[PDB]
């Protein structure tokens, strides 16, 4: 289905549009919805637990303050044998960033691998550059070293992966 | 009901969506609607008095310029035995900020208590960081001291309450 | 009608919503529509001439580059015995700014008077602070002196009129 | 039709609204859709190939990182005897910028000519000032010299073409 | 010159006068506040030195010394001594600390305190960041401000600088 | 060197020449404008001193002194004296005030006033913020500008600096 | 003064003491780290010189020298020599490098390392950018921070400066 | 020291060596490029002086002098003379102009030109803004860059500074 992708057995990433499709989420065994937007209200179906993370998709939004709490929630739900959908509006930046943070913390994968993991399943992902700065700091906190660097290009400072992609 | 919360006997906070539900507001004895958005037009039901506060939810929006005027209006309406709904779009930042300012001015509660008060009723509230700077200044004007400080984290400068929340 | 206000015999200001109401505009003798938004497409009724001014409502949007061209168009239409609607999204910032510039250029009124003129008819107007900087420069170009100053408040730098309003 | 313009035999520029009109695009022989927005989901008709370029219309969005890849795709499609629609939301900034970059790279035209080319067909185009900085750099990379300069006006720094337009 | 008396127990000066023990002893100075990072205390035994190691820059957080320096000048005054607050030019860093002192211990508003120091030492010109910090300190002490930052074509400045430019 | 004549009653210089009374008296100088925070007035009795305590920085609001300094140079000229406007390097602060004077009292546009001072003292190079302020002052005086700020790969500069880089 | 001992093999100082070979030889100094762009190494044969050509500015990337300078002080110590780290004022640049050294080689947290150097040389006052860089280096070494940057009315500063302002 | 030879006709130095005519004449120097605002040309008759009145600051538009200074060094070389490019510290301003010269007239990329000057004068350290400008100039000359600006915990720097911090 358009607008949703499976990342792990207990974690899905999506656009806000899929978040109100009760049947689609039940079909995936989704029990918990993390709404990583300020601007989309929770639909509030009784079937799901809802967690609101009220951030804008902006480089200075302090999304990192939710890295541990959302990652811990995804883990808690999984250990209780449920599954989580982390959604934003576009399924591009806010939700992807939180999924990448979760993969690093609970799947022992570096930031480059965590990006490639999510990107393999949802190729449209594109965390904003501030979110990248925050992910890089979090990676350094977890592993004591970084696998993505911010680099200056003629078009702005971006993670090196974006520069590499621009050259095919 | 989703999208509205009672803060005091004469003050409610909400999303813009509830603002056009005449029956819902009448059921709460609401007589005055403060529309704290630029982008949502007043529905203009004859039953309510309307006050437009045309701000964007942005850290440099000078929301503080409305602290006294909106707080005074809420107080005026209450003393005339009515009730006010302060709404924005998401019910997260603009409206919450104005309600917090009102609680400090007319309920003699410090900024930390005023935040906790609104947060107990509407847990999704999350004033943006600029709004926090402005609330902290207003608190200092009212009480000559502050109960929330802006602190630098790896994810940006935020009020200390957000940093504390990030550690559970 | 909600969302439209008459400023002069040949100039109206509005929200984008009124711009597609053919009957409402015909009732006012409107012959020309200035769409001061990037994000709203022209409805394109055959009855009106359309002018697109594709700006965002942001303090660094260079709205001043349209001061002379839009003001000249309003004047041209008026001298051809028609009338212009200048609309944006909210009828608060972009359209009001262009109307204020027109009043200064073709009605020989200073910036404070031009603001008060539009504000008397549409009290919700609130040009953003960058638009204010640009209006102040344009006023200085026209009259060699200014009647509004940008002042620093605890809540940001704003035109003095906003600070004055905050104290009732 | 409103919201779409032909730039070359194999390249069209549009608003997102036209992008879901299967019949309109088939009528133009469009085989590939480049969706240059984060916020509009691909409609996904089977008849078209879709390419998502998930950028916001903001001066610091690093749109330049897509100059070669989108321009190469337009060229690839054309050489395979198809045609591409590059769309954004408003058909003003993101899509126009990518079309201008393509014209420089594959039609051997300088930046001023490439702008005038697109502007002749879709007069509402108005790339944001950051996009202009990026186009100017790309022009310099391609030709070793520039035909548009950023200039400071009372209303902000803008490409010289915008200043020239403001004086009629 | 390079030295001006501000109160009976407070002098403001340039760095040049700070090491001149005869000049300082003739005014009953017992305490030297060196509001510079770049000038070393001479450390004559007869004076106590307090170093305030700040640059003359708008973001130097000089307001963090308003209470500590004001309190020291006051303490020294009460002990029947006198303080010299000096910087390099006697224009900005030292002037700002003296202004803060006058507000805290002489119960005058910011406008009056600035006018007082300016009358005593006409070259004084706190930098615009120091003015922002003085304005906030005034609001803390009195609950209102008597100088506002205003935008001119040449930058945001305290309104007193705008007024001075037209006279 | 370190001193250049700009008009019959106006000289521009480096700080080094400011204290040389023989040099100044030989040119009939009666007024010294010290456009520095960091150099103290020497205060010879025979000259009147005006201090303009600004740093050579783009955000220093030097434009607040355009009228006051221009008016003083004019007043001194009308009294048959002459003024020296000096800074430290004789490059930026003093050059900017002289340019402003020429526009106000010699009825020349900014381009002409810059070319005039540059011809007299080829090292002059107002900082880019001072240029922004000069441009605004020109627009105030004449209602149009003759120098524009332009973006180059090396920063935003007055177009005269861009032109100079290609010749 | 202008020189303070930090450990048995590490001294911190002002530029003034750097060229005084008798003073340095009396402390067994064999290595001079000149943490300034603006002071030239004197180059007496008997000392090895390392230049760290940074300004005392918040965006100077002094953290790029934390490991290299810390490692050199350690190497010199292990060879039974001693190092002088000097800047101009002995306040910010040199203090910051010494603090970084103490964290890396003396296994103390940032708060303790700052308190240590401050106890030895009370005038020390790293600039706020250097503090940001020290905080990040602390987090790299220990996985937690013991000093936080906090907003005050006078600017964002390390919490230790806020605490000092109230005592 | 304070002087280093870069090519047969180009020397780089500190301000201190600029006035030493014997030192300069011994190297066949006929042209002095003074890349400072703050040091006055000594103006010995035997040398031609070119002043480049820039501060050592990241936003100083030094790139506007890349072609003019490179061309002058080349012209002087072709006339069988030699040029000294000096600043104050011989670290940043003069180093940057020399690097630009090597790219334009010695057909080496930015990495090679930096390595060349650094080998000759190990203290060199262009400021980060000068690096941005050098990178753009390299791209203009060659159509590709060999040094990239990269974010470290201590700021955005040329990758060569990041590499140096780990060795």
DSSP letter for each residue of B75-89: HHHHHTT--EEEE-S
Number of domains, chain G = 1
Structural domain harbouring E8: 1-167
* Distance in angstroms (rounded) separating the CA atoms of residues D23 and A45: 38
Q: Cβ of A69 and B168 within 8 Å?
A: yes
* Chains B and C: 3 or more CB pairs within 8 Å of each other: yes
**Does G98 participate in catalysis according to the annotation?**
no
The 3-state secondary structure of chain F, one letter per residue: CCEEEEECCEEEECHHHHCCHHHHHCCCCCEEEECCCCCCCCCCCCCEEEECCCCCCCCCCHHHHHHHHHHHHHHHHHCCCCEEEECCCCCCHHHHHHHHHHHHHCCCCHHHHHHHHHHHCCCCCCCHHHHHHHHHHHHHHHCCCCCCEEEECCEEEEHHHHHHHCC
**Reduced to 3 states, what is the DSSP secondary structure of residue G108?**
coil
End-to-end CA distance of chain B: 28
Query: Smallest CA–CA separation between D168 and chain A, in Å?
Result: 31
Contacts of B98 (CB under 8 A, 6+ apart): B34, B36, B53, B63, B66, B67, B70, B71, B86
* Distance in angstroms (rounded) separating the CA atoms of residues D59 and D129: 6
State the virtual CA torsion across G97, G99, G105, G108 in degrees, nearest 10.
-160
Query: Smallest CA–CA separation between B166 and chain C, in Å?
Result: 27
Structure tokens at E148: 């506002």
Going edge to edge, which strands form the sheet with F3-7?
F3-7, F10-13, F83-86, F31-34, F48-51
Judge whether G70 and G105 are in contact, CB under 8 Å: yes
Which residues in G lie closer than 8 A to residue H122 (C-beta atoms)? 51
* Distance in angstroms (rounded) separating the CA atoms of residues D73 and D87: 14
Which residues in A lie closer than 8 A to residue D38 (C-beta atoms)? 57, 90, 92-93, 126
Query: Smallest CA–CA separation between H82 and chain G, in Å?
Result: 25
Structure tokens at G43: 């180059």
Judge whether F87 and F56 are in contact, CB under 8 Å: yes
Query: Do β-strands C156-159 and B4-8 pair in parallel, antiparallel, or remain unpaired?
Result: unpaired
CA E133 vs. chain centroid, Å, equals 13
Question: Does the CB of A134 have a partner CB in chain B at under 8 Å?
Answer: yes
* Distance in angstroms (rounded) separating the CA atoms of residues A26 and H147: 52
**Reduced to 3 states, what is the DSSP secondary structure of residue G51?**
strand
* Closest listed residue to residue A96, CA positions, set A70, A76, A63, A118: A118
Q: Cβ of E123 and F68 within 8 Å?
A: no
Structure tokens at B61: 């929006």
Judge whether D123 and D89 are in contact, CB under 8 Å: no
- The H-or-E segment that residue A35 falls in is strand A32-35
Which residues in C lie closer than 8 A to residue D15 (C-beta atoms)? 41
Dihedral pair phi/psi, residue F111, rounded to 5°: -55, -50
A 10 A CB-CB count for C82 gives 16
* Distance in angstroms (rounded) separating the CA atoms of residues E63 and E36: 14
Question: Does the CB of F148 have a partner CB in chain D at under 8 Å?
Answer: yes
* Closest listed residue to residue E106, CA positions, set E5, E6, E4, E3: E6
Q: Cβ of C41 and D126 within 8 Å?
A: no
Structure tokens at A127: 């965390």
Contacts of H159 (CB under 8 A, 6+ apart): H147, H148, H149, H150
Strand partners, E86: E13, E34
* Distance in angstroms (rounded) separating the CA atoms of residues D78 and E105: 80
Question: Does the CB of G58 have a partner CB in chain H at under 8 Å?
Answer: no
* Closest listed residue to residue F7, CA positions, set F35, F36, F33, F27: F27
Q: Using alpha carbons only, what angle is made at residue F36 by residues F34 and F41, rounded to the nearest 5 degrees?
A: 45
* Distance in angstroms (rounded) separating the CA atoms of residues H61 and B116: 51
Phi-psi region of F74 (alpha: psi -120 to 50; beta: other; left: phi over 0): alpha
Which residues in H lie closer than 8 A to residue F18 (C-beta atoms)? none
Which residues in E lie closer than 8 A to residue F37 (C-beta atoms)? 56, 89, 91-92, 125
Helices (H), chain E: 15-18, 21-25, 66-78, 93-105, 110-120, 128-142, 159-165
Q: HSE of F76 in the Cβ direction (CA atoms, 13 Å)?
A: 27
Strand partners, F31: F48, F83
Contacts of F76 (CB under 8 A, 6+ apart): F9, F30, F31, F82, F83
Strand partners, E10: E7, E83
* Distance in angstroms (rounded) separating the CA atoms of residues B103 and A70: 31
**Reduced to 3 states, what is the DSSP secondary structure of residue H152?**
strand
Dihedral pair phi/psi, residue E159, rounded to 5°: -55, -30
Please give the full DSSP string across D50-104, using - where no structure is assigned.
EEE----SSTTS-GGGGHHHHHHHHHHHHHTT--EEEE-SSSSSHHHHHHHHHHH
**DSSP 8-state secondary structure symbol assigned to residue G40:** P
* Distance in angstroms (rounded) separating the CA atoms of residues C137 and H56: 34
* Chains A and B: 3 or more CB pairs within 8 Å of each other: yes
Say what the resolution is, in angstroms. 1.9
Q: Cβ of F123 and H51 within 8 Å?
A: yes
Judge whether C99 and C115 are in contact, CB under 8 Å: no
Which residues in E lie closer than 8 A to residue G14 (C-beta atoms)? 40
Query: How was this entry determined?
Result: X-ray
Which residues in D lie closer than 8 A to residue F149 (C-beta atoms)? 151-152
Structure tokens at D84: 């591409």
**Strand ranges in C59-142 using DSSP code E only, listed in sequence order:** 84-87
Question: Does the CB of E128 have a partner CB in chain C at under 8 Å?
Answer: no
* Residue of A64, A142, A144 to mutate, testing the G interface (most G Cβ within 10 Å of its Cβ): A144
Which residues in H lie closer than 8 A to residue F14 (C-beta atoms)? 40
Structure tokens at E130: 């120091």
Contacts of E116 (CB under 8 A, 6+ apart): E6, E102, E108
Query: Smallest CA–CA separation between H133 and chain D, in Å?
Result: 14
Question: Does the CB of D11 have a partner CB in chain A at under 8 Å?
Answer: no
Touching H: which chains, 3+ CB pairs < 8 A?
A: A, D, F, G
**Strand ranges in chain C using DSSP code E only, listed in sequence order:** 4-8, 11-14, 32-35, 49-52, 84-87, 150-153, 156-159
Surface-to-core class of residue B122, CB atoms within 10 Å of its CB (0-12 exposed, 13-18 middle, 19+ buried): buried
* Residue of D134, D146, D151, D159 to mutate, testing the F interface (most F Cβ within 10 Å of its Cβ): D151
**Reduced to 3 states, what is the DSSP secondary structure of residue D2?**
coil
* Distance in angstroms (rounded) separating the CA atoms of residues D162 and C62: 10
Question: Does the CB of A152 have a partner CB in chain H at under 8 Å?
Answer: yes
- The H-or-E segment that residue D4 falls in is strand D4-8
* Distance in angstroms (rounded) separating the CA atoms of residues H88 and H16: 8
Phi-psi region of E138 (alpha: psi -120 to 50; beta: other; left: phi over 0): alpha
Sign of the torsion angle spanned by Cα atoms D120, D125, D127, D129: positive
Question: Does the CB of H43 have a partner CB in chain F at under 8 Å?
Answer: yes
**Residue in chain B nearest G151 by alpha carbon:** B150
Q: Cβ of G165 and E65 within 8 Å?
A: yes
* Distance in angstroms (rounded) separating the CA atoms of residues G15 and G19: 8
**DSSP 8-state secondary structure symbol assigned to residue A2:** T
* Distance in angstroms (rounded) separating the CA atoms of residues H117 and H111: 10
With b for 16 or more beta-carbon neighbours within 10 A and e for fewer, the B32-61 pattern comes to bbbbbbbbbbbeeeeebeebbbbbbbbbbb
* Distance in angstroms (rounded) separating the CA atoms of residues H106 and F99: 41
Please give the full DSSP string across chain B, using - where no structure is assigned.
-TTEEEEETTEEEE-HHHHT-HHHHHHTT--EEEE--SSSPP---TTSEEEE----SSTTS-GGGGHHHHHHHHHHHHHTT--EEEE-SSSSSHHHHHHHHHHHHHH---HHHHHHHHHHH-TT----HHHHHHHHHHHHHHHSS-S--EEEETTEEEEHHHHHHHT-
**Residue in chain H nearest D141 by alpha carbon:** H143
Question: Does the CB of A9 have a partner CB in chain H at under 8 Å?
Answer: no
**Residue in chain E nearest F133 by alpha carbon:** E154
**Residue in chain A nearest B168 by alpha carbon:** A69
Residues listed for chain D = 168
* Closest listed residue to residue G59, CA positions, set H155, B99, C153, A25: H155
Touching G: which chains, 3+ CB pairs < 8 A?
A: A, B, E, H
Structure tokens at F108: 């020349």
Which residues in F lie closer than 8 A to residue E91 (C-beta atoms)? 37, 53
Structure tokens at H41: 């040309």
* Distance in angstroms (rounded) separating the CA atoms of residues C74 and C95: 12
* Distance in angstroms (rounded) separating the CA atoms of residues D164 and D125: 15
Q: Cβ of F149 and D149 within 8 Å?
A: no
Q: Cβ of F154 and H136 within 8 Å?
A: yes
**Residue in chain A nearest H155 by alpha carbon:** A150
* Distance in angstroms (rounded) separating the CA atoms of residues B9 and A159: 51
* Residue of B15, B155, B162, B167 to mutate, testing the A interface (most A Cβ within 10 Å of its Cβ): B155
- The H-or-E segment that residue D106 falls in is helix D94-107
- The H-or-E segment that residue A22 falls in is helix A22-27
* Distance in angstroms (rounded) separating the CA atoms of residues C57 and C34: 15
Judge whether E81 and E29 are in contact, CB under 8 Å: yes
* Distance in angstroms (rounded) separating the CA atoms of residues A45 and F34: 75
Judge whether E40 and E71 are in contact, CB under 8 Å: no
Contacts of A160 (CB under 8 A, 6+ apart): A148, A149, A150, A151
Touching C: which chains, 3+ CB pairs < 8 A?
A: B, D, E, F
Judge whether H76 and H8 are in contact, CB under 8 Å: no
Please give the full DSSP string across H34-80, using - where no structure is assigned.
E--SSSPP---TTSEEEE----SSTTS-GGGGHHHHHHHHHHHHHTT
Query: Smallest CA–CA separation between C49 and chain D, in Å?
Result: 15
Which residues in H lie closer than 8 A to residue D140 (C-beta atoms)? 139-140
Q: Cβ of B141 and E139 within 8 Å?
A: yes
* Residue of E33, E45, E53 to mutate, testing the G interface (most G Cβ within 10 Å of its Cβ): E53
Sign of the torsion angle spanned by Cα atoms G119, G125, G128, G134: negative
* Distance in angstroms (rounded) separating the CA atoms of residues D41 and A62: 26
* Distance in angstroms (rounded) separating the CA atoms of residues B165 and C90: 36
Judge whether G71 and G19 are in contact, CB under 8 Å: no
* Distance in angstroms (rounded) separating the CA atoms of residues A146 and A161: 13
* Chains A and F: 3 or more CB pairs within 8 Å of each other: no
* Closest listed residue to residue A87, CA positions, set A167, A28, A130: A28
Q: Cβ of F152 and H68 within 8 Å?
A: no
* CATH code of D77's domain: 3.90.190.10
Structure tokens at H12: 């780089």
* Distance in angstroms (rounded) separating the CA atoms of residues B14 and B30: 12
A 10 A CB-CB count for A138 gives 24
């Amino acid at each position: 289905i358009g607008g949703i992708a499976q990342i792990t057995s207990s974690l899905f990433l999506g656009r806000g549009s899929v978040a109100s499709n009760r049947h689609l989420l039940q079909a995936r065994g989704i029990t918990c919805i993390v709404n990583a937007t300020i601007e989309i209200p929770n639909f509030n179906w009784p079937q799901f637990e809802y967690v609101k993370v009220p951030l804008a998709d902006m480089p200075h939004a302090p999304i990192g303050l939710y890295f541990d709490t959302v990652a811990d929630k995804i883990h808690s739900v999984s250990r209780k044998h449920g599954a989580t959908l982390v959604h934003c509006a576009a399924g591009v930046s806010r939700s992807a960033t939180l999924c990448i943070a979760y993969l690093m913390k609970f799947h022992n994968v570096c930031l480059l691998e965590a990006y490639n993991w999510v990107k393999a399943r949802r190729p449209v992902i594109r965390p904003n550059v501030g979110f990248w700065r925050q992910l890089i700091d979090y990676e350094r906190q977890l592993f004591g070293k970084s696998t993505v660097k911010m680099v200056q290009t003629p078009y702005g400072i971006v993670p090196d992966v974006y520069e590499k992609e621009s050259r095919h």
